[PDB]
Amino acid sequence: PLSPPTNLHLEANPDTGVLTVSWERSTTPDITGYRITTTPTNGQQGNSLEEVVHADQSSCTFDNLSPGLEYNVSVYTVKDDKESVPISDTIIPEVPQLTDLSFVDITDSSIGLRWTPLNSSTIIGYRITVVAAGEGIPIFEDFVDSSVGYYTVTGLEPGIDYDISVITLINGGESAPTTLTQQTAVPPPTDLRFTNIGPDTMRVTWAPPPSIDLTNFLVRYSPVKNEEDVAELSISPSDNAVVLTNLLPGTEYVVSVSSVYEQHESTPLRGRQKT
Amino acid sequence: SDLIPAPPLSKVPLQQNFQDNQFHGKWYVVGKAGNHDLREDKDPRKMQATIYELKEDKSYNVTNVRFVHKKCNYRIWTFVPGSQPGEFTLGNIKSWPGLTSWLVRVVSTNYNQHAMVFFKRVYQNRELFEITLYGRTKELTNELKENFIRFSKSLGLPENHIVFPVPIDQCIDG
């Protein structure tokens, strides 16, 4: 008989939407080519496709199969007007996941999300989940339609890591989750102030971030000329000022104040002052 | 980072003949113990409240209430009845990526005074568990608090993993 193909392999790439069918070529010496078919196993869903390749080829592609449907794939060895018994297998192509989820407009209580909505016509929406990374506590869940690629998560706490996921949805299935960790901002102090200036000392003052309970403030300072010479002070969250001692006369210093919650610190508030 | 292994469930009893309609309402968090390392902020912990609303489908609308960073913070979960009365899991657990397991079990209560609740979950292949001593008021008997300590220790948790939060007035009453 005409010997069928062997070693049938089916690879559905969800990012490209393409099914690649491969096989080991027939042992029969003088063949025309191969005929490959695509047939949904659920008789109420999808439709059939057919592909044809040359005798020296051992793969073919099919695009625009429906994610989440089961398909029987058959490969037939072709010899003029004659065909081998097929080799067959089933595959369920995955739902595509988002590949460019990014974060934007990060604040102390809010996180903005952006992504490119996928171009797959059976996608009917996205699921957004927000989980507190430290404890695995679910925080928030919502749904957006298939054409939306933006979302603002609100009502969060500052200085906290959140696992944020966007899952692509079809009727009756979903993609693997696109999950990323994003920390909420620790709010910086504002309005750096320098008073009581002497040869060796200076009073550093700032405005605390409102309505937050910091672990501490963290004061860093170093000479402008040699900036690898950094000293570090830990200040109580209830204090808005510190007196810096043991300084050099006629010298310009860079000073930063950073809010700190649970080891996570704010962007620095920075200013220069000359003794 | 490091975790005390979860106790086998043979070690966690279940309140017999649990009455969902009597567990209903506000419970204050008088004591709590967990398997995660506790960082001390240079601050004692403030008391929280947890409200269990019973629904027509016999599930609970659970609302945790906290006074953190000078605001009121609310968090809501849906607890659905597990295999037995007194047991609960999370409605729609397959909604949450990486969260593969979630168990709540009412260890013991008298409904009008005190409760001990055991929570277990697996998130991203890490097993976390807690025990809460709940009270109908903000304070409980020494005997009861001692009982909770004794029970927590029986689950493998050391003394210093146990906290009794300080009673406060913000958020939790209103």
Swiss-Prot record, chain A:
It is found in: Secreted, Extracellular space, Extracellular matrix; Secreted. It is linked to Glomerulopathy with fibronectin deposits 2: Genetically heterogeneous autosomal dominant disorder characterized clinically by proteinuria, microscopic hematuria, and hypertension that leads to end-stage renal failure in the second to fifth decade of life. Spondylometaphyseal dysplasia, corner fracture type: An autosomal dominant form of spondylometaphyseal dysplasia, a group of short stature disorders distinguished by abnormalities in the vertebrae and the metaphyses of the tubular bones. SMDCF is characterized by flake-like, triangular, or curvilinear ossification centers at the edges of irregular metaphyses that simulate fractures. These corner fractures involve the distal tibia, the ulnar aspect of the distal radius, the proximal humerus, and the proximal femur. It comes from Homo sapiens (Human). This is Fibronectin. Sulfated. Forms covalent cross-links mediated by a transglutaminase, such as F13A or TGM2, between a glutamine and the epsilon-amino group of a lysine residue, forming homopolymers and heteropolymers (e.g. fibrinogen-fibronectin, collagen-fibronectin heteropolymers). Mostly heterodimers or multimers of alternatively spliced variants, connected by 2 disulfide bonds near the carboxyl ends; to a lesser extent homodimers. Interacts with FBLN1, AMBP, TNR, LGALS3BP and COL13A1. Interacts with FBLN7. Interacts with COMP. Interacts (via type III repeats 9-14) with TNFAIP6 (via CUB domain); this interaction enhances fibronectin fibril assembly. TNFAIP6 may act as a bridging molecule between FN1 and THBS1. Interacts with TNR; the interaction inhibits cell adhesion and neurite outgrowth. Interacts with FST3 and MYOC. Interacts with SVEP1. (Microbial infection) Interacts with S.aureus FnbA. Residues 4-98, 99-187, 188-275 form the Fibronectin type-III domain. It comes from the Eukaryota. Glycans are attached at residue 72. Expressed in the inner limiting membrane and around blood vessels in the retina (at protein level). Plasma FN (soluble dimeric form) is secreted by hepatocytes. Cellular FN (dimeric or cross-linked multimeric forms), made by fibroblasts, epithelial and other cell types, is deposited as fibrils in the extracellular matrix. Ugl-Y1, Ugl-Y2 and Ugl-Y3 are found in urine.
UniProtKB/Swiss-Prot annotation, chain B:
It comes from the Eukaryota. The keyword Signal applies. The keyword Membrane does not apply. A carboxymycobactin binds at residues 48-50, 121, 130, 134. Induction: Expression is activated by the oncoprotein BCR-ABL; BCR-ABL misregulates expression via the JAK/STAT pathway and binding of STAT5A to the promoter. Induced by insulin. Disulfide bonds join 72-171. GO terms for cellular component: extracellular exosome; extracellular region; extracellular space; specific granule lumen. Enterobactin binds at residues 102, 130. Glycans are attached at residue 61. InterPro entries: Calycin, LCN2/LCN12, Lipocalin, Lipocalin_CS, Lipocln_cytosolic_FA-bd_dom. Detected in neutrophils (at protein level). Expressed in bone marrow and in tissues that are prone to exposure to microorganism. High expression is found in bone marrow as well as in uterus, prostate, salivary gland, stomach, appendix, colon, trachea and lung. Expressed in the medullary tubules of the kidney. Not found in the small intestine or peripheral blood leukocytes. GO terms for molecular function: enterobactin binding; identical protein binding; iron ion binding; iron ion sequestering activity; protease binding. GO terms for biological process: acute-phase response; cellular response to amyloid-beta; cellular response to hydrogen peroxide; cellular response to hypoxia; cellular response to increased oxygen levels; cellular response to interleukin-1; cellular response to interleukin-6; cellular response to lipopolysaccharide. It is found in: Secreted; Cytoplasmic granule lumen; Cytoplasmic vesicle lumen. Keywords: Apoptosis, Cytoplasmic vesicle, Disulfide bond, Glycoprotein, Immunity, Innate immunity, Ion transport, Iron, Iron transport, Pyrrolidone carboxylic acid, Secreted, Signal, Transport. Iron-trafficking protein involved in multiple processes such as apoptosis, innate immunity and renal development. Binds iron through association with 2,3-dihydroxybenzoic acid (2,3-DHBA), a siderophore that shares structural similarities with bacterial enterobactin, and delivers or removes iron from the cell, depending on the context. Iron-bound form (holo-24p3) is internalized following binding to the SLC22A17 (24p3R) receptor, leading to release of iron and subsequent increase of intracellular iron concentration. PANTHER family: LIPOCALIN (PTHR11430), NEUTROPHIL GELATINASE-ASSOCIATED LIPOCALIN (PTHR11430:SF13). Belongs to the calycin superfamily. Lipocalin family. Monomer. Homodimer; disulfide-linked. Heterodimer; disulfide-linked with MMP9. This is Neutrophil gelatinase-associated lipocalin.
